[PDB]
Structures are given as C-alpha cells and as structure tokens.
C-alpha cells in the first residue's frame, strides 16, 4: 500500500542566473514570512492549497480538451535526517516567466516562515515544456536554471530552520495535515501513506448530496452520534461567496470556518449570532484572510442570521408538528436572542420564530405573531396575550373571558419567560403587545 513519487531525478547542467526581487517583492517576502500568519505551521496548509489549485487547473484543461487524465496527487515527504520537508504535486506546472515574475497567492512565500532556504523544481504541463530550478534563502536574491529530470507539476523542497525541525518529523506534519487539509479535493500522501478521506460536501450542488452524506458530515463537525434534525445547505455569490451547511441536532441542548476547502478556525464563534450557537456545521467563504475575527465577518453574520431565520420560518410552513418540537427544544435561544438584540427590527425577525397557543385555536396547536395578526380585523395597534399556568386557567380567566364575545382573539403563554419576552419585544409589526390583565 506504500505509494510515493518523490525522488531525486532532477539535475542542473549549466549555472544559475541570479535575480533580485524588487521593492515590492522585498516587502511581500518579509511581511508574509513573519508578520502575516500567527502560527508557522500553516505553511503546510498554504502549499497544499497551492498544490490543489494546480491540480485542478490541469484537470479542467485536460477534461476541456477531452484529453485523458494522468495521476493527480499531492505528496509530502519529511526528512528529519536532512531536516527537510517536501511537497510535490503533479498539477499544471510553472513556466520560466512565472517562476521569474510571480494570483495563485502569496501562500507559497509562507514557506520562508519556517525555512532558511527553499529549493523548487517545476515543469509546465504544456507539451515540449522545459523544467526549471528556483533557489532562494529568502534574502531577496533567487537563482534560476533550466533543470532536467523535472516531472510535470511542481516540487518544493524546504530546508527548515534550526528551531523549525519539528516539521521534518512525520508525526508533527500528519497532525498539521489532518487539522487544516482533511477535505483536500485531490489524493494526498505523506511519506507514501494516504492521509485524506473526507469529502467537502458543502461545495457540492445541494441537490446532489444525499442523507447519509449529511449524516456522516454532521457527526464529524458536531462530533455527535445522533442525526441532524434540520439541514440547510446554503450557497450564494451575490452577498458574498458562501458555501455552507447548517445542522440542528436531533438531541436537545460550534460552526467551522473554511475557505476553499481549507480550515481557518475550528471554532468560528463570531460567524453566527450568539443565539444561533446551537447550530452545527461549516461555513466556507473565499472572503476571509486569531482572537479578533470581526471585520466584514459581521456582514456574513447578518447574511447567515437572515437566511437561517427564513429557513426555520419555511420549516414552520411545511411542517408545524416537527417545528413545534423544535421551538419547544430551542425556544430558549430565540428568546435570548430577542431580549439581547439592539435594533427593534432584529427583535421582530427572531420573534417571527416564536409560537404560542391562541384562543381561536384548539388547545395544543401553536401560532406565530404574523399568523395571529393577519386574521385581525378592524383592529389597530394591538396584539392581545394572556399568561396563565395552563390553557384551562387561561380560558376560564375573567380577563380573557371578557374577550370571549368581544373583539379579538388572545395568545396564551404558560411560562413566565415567554411573557417577559413579549414585554421586552413591545410592538410587533403594526401592533403593540398588550397583556389582558393590564
Ligand atoms: N504548486 C504550484 N503550482 C503552480 Cl502552477 C503555481 C504557480 N505559482 N505557484 C506558487 C509559486 C511558486 C514559486 C514561486 C512563486 C509562486 Br506565486 O517562485 C518559486 O516557486 C504555484 N505552485
């Protein structure tokens, strides 16, 4: 089962031509190498991500041209003996000009975060392409030379710093891979061992994913053994770029942040409003660059809050008995969110999820503030509710019994935390929330 492709096949016949980065390239290299990423280990993530993109570009090209498909793989090799770590892909490679002038991303230069020297071999996939070697110690000077024995694609050999030797031990590198790159779109091997088995199902067409995949992934992200009660597969480009799946556990009572199938933060606590912290799943967006995550993250937070509210509302429409169970189990969060919200309009959005018993309905079945209001006739600026220990006492309440042959229907709350929520909300839509007993 041991499968490796990394070996010394490369040789350079002539001497190298020395180049020197410009004022820009000098700033870039310095900032990315020590000022940009907080943890140094993410260089593995960036290079893996680069290798994936190059693999994709070649595959799309061959498939577009109708050509057959070669081995499309990503390989990592650690050498603690030589203090090196190497990553090779068999993707679309690089031309001489690209090796010289170079938006695949900076991500490649993140290597100088842990290396005092980087040695590169690349060969373009286009027929008759030549291979080239690229050398650099990161001092703004790099060398270029035509190389033979270069396989199509790109091979990066990192000569690790004295105190970065940890990334030459397989055990350390394996952990880094499984942490950040477990959903990589192409086969990934480490010292010949296959490492990635999980599929990024959030990138799929939602109507192609089936139940068992959503169950598997839910159990992964939520580290859970039950099943998702609710599943929302949300994809969008207009507001921002968004690839995401949200789950509500079957069980009674966080979301991962990804970008292009690579992990940014396992606990994206700021991605959703605090009251939606019961939601499990993943958010993938190309729009994200630590303790301070908030920036335009908020814009995404607001997008997701609105999409989730509409989701649960739509759920209410199609299924009321299931949603009534959901409201029973998770109402707490909605109430917390309503009392927490600063803007009134946000309060009323979340409040659209609340369900209460009504006087004009059989005891047991619930209604929403909107549903109550629609039937309201010749009624201005009022929503009437009564809080009692139970439906029995609510109906037999003289306060309500007054509304018996009178104008309006009356909502029934049986818990004090529901009444306080209405009091706090004050007005909803065109109407003010008012207690029968004053
Ligand atoms: N794996 C892979 N495949 C391809 Cl097609 C490309 C294209 N750019 N890069 C990153 C990169 C690598 C370099 C470099 C500048 C950059 Br930007 O100078 C030395 O090597 C790639 N990496």
């Amino acid at each position: 089962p041991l499968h490796s492709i990394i070996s010394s096949t490369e040789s350079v016949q002539g001497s190298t031509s020395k180049h020197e980065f410009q004022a820009e390239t000098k700033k870039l290299l310095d900032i990315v190498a020590r000022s940009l990423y907080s943890e140094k280990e993410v260089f593995i993530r960036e290079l893996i991500s680069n290798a994936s993109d190059a693999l994709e570009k070649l595959r799309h090209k061959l498939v577009s041209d109708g050509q057959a498909l070669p081995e499309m793989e990503i390989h990592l090799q650690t050498n603690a003996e030589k203090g090196t770590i190497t990553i090779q892909d068999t993707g679309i490679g690089m031309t001489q000009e690209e090796l010289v002038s170079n938006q695949f991303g900076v991500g490649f230069y993140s290597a100088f975060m842990v290396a005092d020297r980087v040695e590169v071999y690349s060969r373009s996939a286009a027929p008759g392409s030549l291979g080239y070697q690229w050398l650099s110690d990161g001092s703004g000077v790099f060398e270029i030379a035509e190389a033979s024995g270069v396989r199509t694609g790109t091979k990066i050999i990192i000569h690790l710093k004295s105190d970065c030797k940890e990334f030459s031990s397989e055990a350390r590198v394996r952990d880094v891979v499984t942490k950040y790159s477990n959903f990589v779109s192409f086969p990934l091997y480490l010292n010949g061992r296959r490492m990635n088995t999980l599929q990024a199902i959030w990138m799929m067409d939602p109507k192609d994913v089936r139940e068992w995949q959503h169950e598997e992934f839910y159990r992964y992200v939520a580290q859970a053994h039950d099943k998702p009660r609710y599943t929302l597969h949300y994809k969008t480009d207009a507001p921002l770029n968004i690839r995401s799946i949200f789950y509500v556990p079957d069980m009674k009572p966080s979301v991962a942040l990804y970008s292009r199938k690579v992990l940014i933060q396992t606990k994206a606590t700021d991605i959703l409003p605090k009251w939606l912290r019961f939601i499990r799943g993943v958010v993938d967006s190309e729009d994200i660059p630590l303790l301070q995550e908030s920036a335009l993250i908020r814009k995404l937070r607001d997008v997701l809050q609105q999409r989730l509210i509409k989701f649960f509302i739509d759920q209410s429409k199609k299924d009321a008995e299931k949603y009534a169970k959901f409201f029973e189990d998770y109402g707490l969060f909605m109430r917390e969110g309503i009392v927490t919200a600063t803007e009134q309009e946000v309060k009323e959005d979340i409040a659209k999820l609340l369900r209460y018993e009504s006087s004009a309905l059989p005891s047991g079945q619930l209604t929403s503030l909107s549903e109550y209001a629609s039937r309201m006739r010749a009624g201005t600026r009022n929503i009437y509710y009564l809080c009692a220990p139970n439906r029995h006492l609510a109906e037999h309440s003289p306060y309500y019994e007054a509304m018996k042959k009178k104008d309006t229907e009356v909502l029934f709350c049986f818990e004090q935390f529901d009444e306080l929520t209405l009091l706090h909300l004050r007005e909803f839509d065109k109407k003010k929330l008012i207690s029968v007993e004053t």
Side-chain angles (χ1 to χ4, degrees):
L2 187 108
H3 176 45
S4 193
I5 69 161
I6 301 180
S7 62
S8 299
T9 54
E10 300 86 0
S11 64
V12 171
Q13 177 172 75
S15 64
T16 73
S17 50
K18 335 297 172 186
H19 294 69
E20 197 190 48
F21 293 102
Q22 195 132 356
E24 293 181 296
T25 30
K26 202 38 200 158
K27 107 82 204 112
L28 282 273
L29 218 359
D30 303 343
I31 293 305
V32 172
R34 43 208 170 186
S35 169
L36 178 58
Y37 299 103
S38 61
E39 202 129 11
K40 58 184 170 179
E41 64 187 4
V42 294
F43 77 94
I44 289 165
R45 177 186 69 183
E46 302 299 318
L47 294 172
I48 286 173
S49 174
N50 279 350
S52 177
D53 286 342
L55 281 165
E56 186 56 73
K57 188 181 171 178
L58 170 73
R59 182 189 196 274
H60 178 84
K61 177 191 162 181
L62 295 170
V63 173
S64 292
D65 289 340
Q67 264 67 347
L69 296 181
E71 288 189 355
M72 288 172 300
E73 305 173 352
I74 303 170
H75 286 250
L76 284 75
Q77 172 184 300
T78 64
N79 205 284
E81 171 183 333
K82 299 177 181 184
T84 70
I85 177 171
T86 297
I87 177 174
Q88 180 181 354
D89 67 76
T90 56
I92 216 174
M94 305 176 65
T95 71
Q96 198 190 26
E97 190 189 13
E98 297 167 355
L99 284 169
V100 172
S101 297
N102 302 352
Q103 346 274 260
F104 227 57
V106 181
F108 161 84
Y109 292 90
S110 61
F112 296 99
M113 188 181 307
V114 305
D116 54 24
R117 212 219 315 169
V118 176
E119 164 184 12
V120 179
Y121 301 96
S122 196
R123 181 185 154 197
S124 176
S129 289
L130 293 167
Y132 296 91
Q133 168 200 67
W134 180 102
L135 305 178
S136 202
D137 58 17
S139 59
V141 172
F142 65 100
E143 309 171 60
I144 301 189
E146 180 174 326
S148 72
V150 170
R151 185 178 174 158
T152 304
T154 300
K155 176 172 169 187
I156 300 156
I157 308 182
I158 293 179
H159 294 82
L160 297 163
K161 292 181 175 63
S162 52
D163 57 344
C164 296
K165 285 284 187 294
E166 57 185 322
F167 299 102
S168 63
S169 77
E170 176 167 352
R172 176 74 171 99
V173 176
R174 168 182 288 107
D175 293 344
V176 176
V177 170
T178 66
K179 178 178 184 183
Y180 293 102
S181 304
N182 220 347
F183 292 86
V184 175
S185 192
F186 291 90
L188 197 148
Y189 302 76
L190 177 61
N191 300 340
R193 295 179 177 181
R194 183 59 180 268
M195 288 284 71
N196 52 344
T197 56
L198 281 60
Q199 181 176 26
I201 48 153
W202 59 90
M203 287 308 188
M204 299 185 187
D205 179 21
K207 304 181 179 179
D208 286 338
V209 191
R210 262 293 271 268
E211 296 200 19
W212 64 269
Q213 297 188 286
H214 278 302
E215 297 200 11
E216 280 191 359
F217 182 64
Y218 160 74
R219 289 198 270 264
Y220 175 87
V221 294
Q223 289 194 316
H225 298 94
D226 60 334
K227 300 187 178 188
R229 171 194 321 228
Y230 283 130
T231 304
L232 164 64
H233 197 173
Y234 183 46
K235 303 181 62 183
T236 182
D237 292 299
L240 313 94
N241 169 269
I242 301 180
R243 312 289 182 269
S244 78
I245 305 172
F246 302 111
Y247 301 113
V248 173
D250 246 331
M251 158 192 60
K252 292 190 301 174
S254 183
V255 168
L257 177 47
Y258 279 78
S259 186
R260 315 188 58 242
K261 294 180 191 174
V262 87
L263 176 62
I264 305 170
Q265 195 172 10
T266 63
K267 318 165 193 59
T269 174
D270 300 334
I271 287 301
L272 297 176
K274 293 179 179 179
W275 72 271
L276 279 161
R277 66 194 179 271
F278 61 89
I279 293 287
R280 298 281 170 267
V282 52
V283 175
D284 194 322
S285 179
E286 301 175 338
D287 302 325
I288 306 178
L290 300 181
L291 296 172
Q292 291 179 343
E293 174 181 10
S294 68
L296 194 45
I297 287 284
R298 143 154 50 261
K299 172 173 174 181
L300 173 67
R301 181 178 45 79
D302 284 342
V303 169
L304 298 187
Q305 181 174 229
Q306 307 305 316
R307 184 50 273 237
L308 281 166
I309 293 183
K310 175 196 176 182
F311 170 74
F312 289 126
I313 294 185
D314 298 344
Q315 232 60 6
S316 300
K317 272 301 215 184
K318 276 170 17 186
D319 191 335
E321 224 164 312
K322 191 180 174 170
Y323 182 90
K325 213 281 190 169
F326 164 77
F327 172 76
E328 179 171 339
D329 293 342
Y330 289 99
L332 169 162
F333 292 94
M334 295 150 50
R335 285 187 295 269
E336 169 196 306
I338 295 173
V339 180
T340 299
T342 63
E343 308 293 1
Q344 183 67 19
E345 69 169 69
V346 183
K347 296 182 183 304
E348 305 188 16
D349 280 328
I350 303 174
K352 296 167 182 183
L353 299 188
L354 300 175
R355 294 295 181 276
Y356 300 115
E357 282 197 24
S358 177
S359 59
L361 283 188
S363 68
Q365 287 175 329
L366 304 168
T367 307
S368 59
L369 296 174
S370 292
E371 290 175 333
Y372 168 98
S374 60
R375 322 231 246 192
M376 220 185 311
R377 20 78 168 204
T380 85
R381 92 144 108 142
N382 249 337
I383 308 185
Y384 295 147
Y385 72 86
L386 175 71
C387 187
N390 54 43
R391 181 82 170 203
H392 175 43
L393 292 188
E395 300 172 340
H396 280 75
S397 170
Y399 295 109
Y400 158 72
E401 212 166 34
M403 304 283 185
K404 196 183 259 256
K405 276 298 178 216
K406 199 180 170 61
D407 332 289
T408 327
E409 58 180 273
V410 176
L411 301 175
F412 293 151
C413 330
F414 311 110
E415 295 292 334
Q416 174 178 344
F417 48 70
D418 288 307
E419 182 167 21
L420 296 183
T421 304
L422 289 188
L423 286 176
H424 170 83
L425 183 64
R426 312 195 327 234
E427 77 201 343
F428 183 85
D429 196 28
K430 287 82 173 180
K431 337 241 178 187
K432 255 239 181 180
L433 302 167
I434 299 192
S435 184
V436 184
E437 329 181 20
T438 227

